[PDB]
Structure formats: structure tokens, C-alpha cells
């Protein structure tokens, strides 16, 4: 009975732990796998589109963002508050034109429309920029569900890699944001850094004409979302600390670097944004002081907390056990969830670290990454990344073994190196 709220219709969550709390005589690592379940107040909306002079090569990518964006706007729930920013060296908000938001009916949706029909390519690419000019929108909005969709084709070569995160910094905890990349000369670090930061994900448009059926799921999965801000609160005893706290399902996120301090050290807090009718996991590892043979201690306390308006509540909560035992059959059991997810960061990194070295002509290296990742997604049933790995490498004749290709689509490896952190589930 902690928190008090401040006036509600958030989600019910479903709340599960998976590990397996026993632990051999020296052991100071306890890992669980929090599984959580969200079942069925104003949205903002900013959807920032590259208006850089590469958009026009080929004409077809300045195109298919204008009909893109048309379909988000139609997408939009009546009443939704948005914004349109044109990228460049700098930043432009296009509709609306008065500085103040509007919501969504059909006369803003018409006049956002012939705005963005008036969208033309010209200039630099200053990301950094464009997410200010977006924050400064959502600071209009402070208790929206805020989301922003970002689209380039290039790299950020306007601004300094401090700039951008400068910029991304500002960003955290005022809007979350999905990241979309067009074509094959963008960078998918740079795309990869602002939607970790910003609690999303990174895709690539290979082909424009998917585009706006793109623009349509990201915005209606953003319609969906009932509550604007909730944390995932870690308490862990005196002693005891966090050695990683990972999303793992349905995307590899590390939250360890974004813990907000809570009222005492023993508390904190890692971001999760917004929430509609969906699932997500999360991998903790908590490293503790052992206890005897016998004793159980709580390594962990978890709680989802949403943050609403000047007050709290409670979600969900669930405790991380820790048993000593020397009973082996207890100990040796291997905890299936988290044993799946430990394996899916691996072959995460493995894919791009294969990738980079591919990309060097650091071949031995990228076979042995890529093997490794390869082997990873087999046994994880992963049949998707399965697929995107085959056309990266080949089996080589003599000794059948799976080998890097010395020479690889760009696009391919790009497709890759993007969804390496889209898992599977357990
Ligand atoms: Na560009």
C-alpha cells in the first residue's frame, strides 16, 4: 500500500517469474526470467521524416515517405495530438503550423496531408536536431503517451556522434521512438543508438513500397498503448548487486546503464515506456552475498511501477529466490527460460561482431562468429535469423562446414546486423 495515485485505466499485468532459485555451495549468481503480460490517456504523435537531398535518389524513397506518412495520419486515433518535423542540417515543423498541437478530426488529418505532399529533398541530415525539435513538442504534453517515428536513408554526417548524443540524452524519459531506415547507406549503429535509448526498435525498408503499411503497424501499435510510463523497480538486499538487467523478448534490449536511483541504493529503477496489450520478458542477474547451506534469502524484489500525473501505482510484483542446497539434483537443473535467453544476447552479439569482421575482409574471424551465431540460432529454432545467416555464408565443399562469405550482399548484411536483436521467444 506504498503509492498513492492521483486520480484510473491502465492494463492488468501478469507477472511470472522463471529460474530455478537453487544454488551449489559457492554460488553468488541468482538469474531469473520475468515474464510480463499486459491485457486490456492522450497520445502524441511526432513523426519525423529525412527530407536530406539523397531522398530524391531514388525519387521512389521521397515518395513512398510522403505516402507513408499520409497512411500514419489516417492511422491516427480521432483525438490524437501529432506533429510532422521535415529533417535536414536542421529541423522544421510542418504541420501543425501554430506552434501548439492539434488533435486529430478531419480537417488536421486533410491539412497535415497537403503539408506533407509539399515535403521536397534538399540539405544535411542532423538527427540530433530533429529529436530536439520533437522534444520540444512533447514537452507541450507532459502526461501523453509519447511516441515519435523516425525515418532516414543516410548517415548523420551533419552533426557531431556528441551532438546526436547530447541530443539522445535530452530525449530519454520524455518520448519513446521507433526508427526506421531506408535503403542501404544509413548506419545501423547510429539508428541502433537512439531507439535503445528511446525504448524501441530499429527496421529496414529494403524495398520502398512496403513502406506504408510499415508506417501503418508502428502507428496503430502506438494507438494501442494505455499507460505512458511504467517502471521495472529492482530492490536487492544489502550487499547484493545488479550485475544486468535485459530486455530479451521480443527484442534484445540492455536496460543495466538507464537504472534512474530510487529513495535508497537498494532501489532503482529501469525504464519500460509504454504499454498496451502485449508481452515482453526481461533477463535479471543478481549477484549476492551466499548464504549457508539451507538458507534462502530474496535476492530480488521486482515491481512494475506505472508513474501517472504526480502519483504511482503498482502493477505487478514478483520476488527472485536464492536456496543453497547440496542436493545436486535441485542445483544442476538448468532453468529453460533463462538458459533460451542467455543464448539468444550471445548470438545477438555474435551476429554482429561476425558482421563487422565480414565487412573488414577479417574472414576467419566472421566464420567463427557467424558459426557461433549460426549454431545459436538452430538450437533456438530461430528460423528466421536461421535464413538471414545462409545468405552471409556458405558451406564450404570439403570439410561441409559453414564458412563467411568473402563477398556479401550489402544489403543482406545490413537486413542482418538490424534484426540481430530481434529474438525468439522461449
Ligand atoms: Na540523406
Given amino acids: 500500500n506504498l503509492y498513492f495515485q492521483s486520480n484510473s485505466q491502465y492494463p492488468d499485468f501478469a507477472f511470472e517469474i522463471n529460474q530455478n532459485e537453487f544454488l551449489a555451495a559457492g554460488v553468488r549468481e541468482v538469474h531469473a526470467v520475468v515474464t510480463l503480460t499486459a491485457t486490456a490517456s492522450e ?6 521524416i529525412d527530407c536530406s537531398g539523397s531522398m530524391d535518389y531514388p525519387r521512389t524513397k521521397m515518395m513512398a515517405a510522403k505516402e507513408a506518412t499520409k497512411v500514419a495520419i489516417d492511422t491516427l486515433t480521432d483525438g490524437a495530438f501529432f506533429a510532422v518535423v521535415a529533417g535536414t542540417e536542421g529541423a522544421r515543423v ?33 538527427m540530433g536536431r530533429w529529436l530536439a525539435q520533437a522534444g520540444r513538442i512533447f514537452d507541450t504534453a507532459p502526461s501523453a503517451i509519447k511516441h515519435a517515428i ?18 539522445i540524452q535530452s530525449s530519454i524519459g520524455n518520448f519513446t521512438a521507433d526508427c526506421r531506415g531506408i535503403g542501404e547507406d544509413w548506419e545501423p549503429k547510429e539508428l541502433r543508438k537512439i531507439a535503445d535509448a528511446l525504448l524501441g526498435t530499429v527496421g529496414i525498408i529494403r524495398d520502398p513500397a512496403t513502406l506504408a503499411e510499415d508506417f501503418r503497424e508502428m502507428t496503430a501499435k502506438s494507438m494501442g498503448k494505455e499507460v505512458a510510463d511504467v ?38 529503477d529501469y525504464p519500460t515506456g509504454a504499454w498496451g496489450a502485449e508481452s ?23 515491481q512494475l511501477v506505472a508513474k501517472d500525473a504526480g502519483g504511482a501505482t503498482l502493477l505487478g510484483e514478483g520476488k527472485i529466490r536464492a536456496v543453497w542446497t547440496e542436493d545436486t539434483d535441485l542445483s544442476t537443473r538448468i532453468n529453460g527460460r533463462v538458459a533460451h535467453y542467455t543464448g539468444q544476447a550471445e548470438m545477438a552479439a555474435a551476429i554482429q561482431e561476425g558482421l563487422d569482421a565480414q565487412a573488414a575482409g577479417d574472414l576467419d574471424t566472421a566464420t567463427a562468429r557467424l558459426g557461433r551465431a549460426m549454431d545459436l540460432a538452430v ?4 528460423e528466421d535469423t536461421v535464413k538471414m545467416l545462409r545468405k552471409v555464408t556458405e558451406v564450404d565443399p570439403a570439410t561441409s ?12 548484411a545490413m537486413e542482418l546486423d538490424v534484426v540481430s536483436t530481434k529474438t525468439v521467444r522461449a
Fill in 379 to 382: 538450437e533456438s529454432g530461430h
Fill in 231 to 268: 517502471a521495472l523497480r529492482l530492490w536487492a538486499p544489502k550487499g547484493a548487486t545488479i550485475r544486468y538487467v535485459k530486455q530479451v523478448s521480443p527484442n534484445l534490449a540492455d536496460l543495466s546503464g538507464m537504472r534512474v536511483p530510487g529513495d535508497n541504493p537498494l532501489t532503482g
Fill in 43 to 48: 497520445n502524441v504523435e511526432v513523426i519525423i
Fill in 150 to 167: 523516425l525515418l532516414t536513408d543516410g548517415k548523420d554526417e551533419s552533426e557531431t556522434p556528441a551532438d546526436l548524443a547530447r541530443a
Fill in 280 to 302: 515482453r520478458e526481461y533477463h535479471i542477474c543478481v549477484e549476492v552475498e551466499p548464504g549457508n547451506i539451507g538458507q534462502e534469502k530474496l535476492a530480488g524484489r521486482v
Fill in 94 to 126: 510542418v504541420y501543425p503550423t501554430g506552434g501548439q498541437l492539434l488533435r486529430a478530426d478531419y480537417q488536421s488529418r486533410a491539412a497535415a496531408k497537403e503539408a506533407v505532399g509539399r515535403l521536397h529533398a534538399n540539405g544535411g541530415t542532423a
Fill in 401 to 412: 562446414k559453414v564458412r563467411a562469405k568473402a563477398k556479401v550482399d550489402k544489403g543482406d
